[PDB]
Amino acid sequence: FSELLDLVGGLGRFQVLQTMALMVSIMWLCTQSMLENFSAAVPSHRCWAPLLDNSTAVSTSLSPEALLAISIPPGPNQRPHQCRRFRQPQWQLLDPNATATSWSEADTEPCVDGWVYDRSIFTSTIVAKWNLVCDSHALKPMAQSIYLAGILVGAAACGPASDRFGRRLVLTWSYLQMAVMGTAAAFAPAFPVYCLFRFLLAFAVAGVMMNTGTLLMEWTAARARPLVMTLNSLGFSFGHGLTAAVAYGVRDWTLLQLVVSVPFFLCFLYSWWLPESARWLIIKGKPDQALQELRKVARINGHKEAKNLTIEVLMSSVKEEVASAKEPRSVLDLFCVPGLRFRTCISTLCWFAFGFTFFGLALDLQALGSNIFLLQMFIGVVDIPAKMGALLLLSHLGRRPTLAASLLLAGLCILANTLVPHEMGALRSALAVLGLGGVGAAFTCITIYSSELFPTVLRMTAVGLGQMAARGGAILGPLVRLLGVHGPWLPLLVYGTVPVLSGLAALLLPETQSL
Ligand SMILES: CC(C)(Sc1ccncc1-c1ccc(C#N)c2ccccc12)C(=O)O
Ligand SMILES: *[C@@H]1O[C@H](CO)[C@@H](O)[C@H](O)[C@H]1NC(C)=O
Numbered sequence: 001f002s003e004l005l006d007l008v009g010g011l012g013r014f015q016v017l018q019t020m021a022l023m024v025s026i027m028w029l030c031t032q033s034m035l036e037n038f039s040a041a042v043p044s045h046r047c048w049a050p051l052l053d054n055s056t057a058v059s060t061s062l063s064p065e066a067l068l069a070i071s072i073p074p075g076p077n078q079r080p081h082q083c084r085r086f087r088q089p090q091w092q093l094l095d096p097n098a099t100a101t102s103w104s105e106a107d108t109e110p111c112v113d114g115w116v117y118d119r120s121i122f123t124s125t126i127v128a129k130w131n132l133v134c135d136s137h138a139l140k141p142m143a144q145s146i147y148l149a150g151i152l153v154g155a156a157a158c159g160p161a162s163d164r165f166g167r168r169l170v171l172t173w174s175y176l177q178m179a180v181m182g183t184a185a186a187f188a189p190a191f192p193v194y195c196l197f198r199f200l201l202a203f204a205v206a207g208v209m210m211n212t213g214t215l216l217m218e219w220t221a222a223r224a225r226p227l228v229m230t231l232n233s234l235g236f237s238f239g240h241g242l243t244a245a246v247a248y249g250v251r252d253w254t255l256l257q258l259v260v261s262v263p264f265f266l267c268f269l270y271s272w273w274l275p276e277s278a279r280w281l282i283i284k285g286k287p288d289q290a291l292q293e294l295r296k297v298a299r300i301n302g303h304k305e306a307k308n309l310t311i312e313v314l315m316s317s318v319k320e321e322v323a324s325a326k327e328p329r330s331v332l333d334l335f336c337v338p339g340l341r342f343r344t345c346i347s348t349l350c351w352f353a354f355g356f357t358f359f360g361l362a363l364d365l366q367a368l369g370s371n372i373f374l375l376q377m378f379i380g381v382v383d384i385p386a387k388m389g390a391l392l393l394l395s396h397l398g399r400r401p402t403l404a405a406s407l408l409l410a411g412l413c414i415l416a417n418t419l420v421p422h423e424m425g426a427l428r429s430a431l432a433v434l435g436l437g438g439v440g441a442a443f444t445c446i447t448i449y450s451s452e453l454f455p456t457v458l459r460m461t462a463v464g465l466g467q468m469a470a471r472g473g474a475i476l477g478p479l480v481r482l483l484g485v486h487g488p489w490l491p492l493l494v495y496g497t498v499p500v501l502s503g504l505a506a507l508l509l510p511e512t513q514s515l
């Protein structure tokens with residue numbers, strides 16, 4: 001097949017333009033995925049109390065601190081209890097002579113009158129709008145997990161649909177669905193509707209990712225292919241910084257969601273100018289349309305070759321693809337081969353570790369540090385050089401030590417956040433940034449490495465297994481946080497042990513550098 005690109009030009013003006021456009025689309029995609037850090041931030045909260053909140057009631061010489069103590073008992077975090085209040089005002093607690101032994105838990109009640117939230121940092125968030133707190137605290141990670149599960153469903157759907165309807169058309173309708181579902185998610189009235197709309201948005205996102213990957217690889221020459229995939233991965237690194245920049249200015253989750261959704265309308269517009277997959281069309285036996293697209297691309301590259309192509313070379317040079325694609329090969333076939341089974345196990349577990357760790361950590365930054373805006377921007381800042389160095393090291397030390405070191409370093413960096421004492425926020429934030437950068441480098445390493453571990457026929461199906469495993473682990477990511485009720489060390493230790501274990505497994509993979 002390559003000869004057609006070598007004729008039309010495999011890395012010309014057209015490829016540069018298309019790469020820039022799809023990288024921009026991925027930037028906005030990353031903003032969409034990161035948003036739940038800022039759209040669902042948990043502001044500090046307490047029960048509503050008659051003395052504290054009824055501004056028309058009798059004011060007194062007592063300051064707000066003393067009244068707060070008179071109204072609400074202390075919680076485990078050496079801070080006001082976040083879910084219950086005193087049944088009757090504890091005037092006896094005004095004195096320093098008082099002791100907490102004076103009040104029974106029977107003297108306390110849950111927030112019958114609802115909650116009061118801090119508005120200083122975020123003006124409005126999902127948590128404060130639909131009271132996803134206390135008894136309902138499980139629902140926030142539930143929302144994140146549902147969003148991530150929509151991606152698994154979307155991939156399983158968009159595979160067949162993309163083959164039936166073509167890459168560009170599915171990408172276009174995916175952009176449109178992202179726009180419509182996202183703007184609806186901003187205005188939605190009630191939490192079930194928000195869950196539904198986030199799920200459909202995930203259904204769109206899966207298609208965007210898969211079809212972008214397919215479209216870039218088809219039009220890119222073989223030797224430049226890893227670099228193009230690396231740029232597609234750097235799009236997310238820039239997306240982190242974009243999320244920080246947007247969230248700093250916009251503090252209202254309705255407006256934030258609306259702002260990050262609208263740009264996808266523009267992608268719907270300019271995706272109409274991009275060309276359809278040539279290989280898909282030729283497989284569909286339509287050489288006239290494929291040749292129209294090809295000579296259009298050649299015109300963009302300014303070549304003379306528009307006068308030289310014929311349908312016979314177009315069809316014949318793809319005859320091998322047409323013949324080989326007929327075979328009934330899927331995941332079950334991959335598991336049969338004696339020499340491939342161990343490779344499959346370890347590769348799948350590496351994808352699983354990536355999804356698990358990244359979507360566990362990157363969506364609750366509020367727990368890893370002290371200022372989530374700067375933490376987001378620094379995740380971007382560290383991810384960029386981490387991925388570029390990952391490429392520059394992967395091409396020299398071999399896939400095996402590069403991937404193994406990436407995963408092991410990421411896991412050990414995250415584990416360090418358990419051991420460093422809670423109050424040292426600066427060092428903890430730095431370690432968290434480094435760990436997430438390590439996971440990004442591991443993503444690049446595994447993307448390139450998995451493509452080489454398998455024979456050319458099974459390559460794409462094995463990559464499919466890997467991606468599905470990554471999404472499966474991402475779904476479990478958020479649920480791990482529910483264990484945090486028993487303490488913060490347990491969720492973070494679970495997040496840290498898995499990537500280290502998979503890294504020690506990655507060390508056993510066969511090398512594939514051209515040694
Ligand atoms: C889960 C994956 C494998 S990826 C994905 C899906 C949804 N949200 C974000 C990402 C994502 C996470 C880390 C990356 C890194 N480094 C990255 C790079 C490029 C594109 C997406 C990601 C998929 O379903 O395809
Ligand atoms: C607030 O205090 C005023 C004081 O006159 C009272 O009339 C009113 O019922 C109170 N409302 C609430 C909700 O506490």
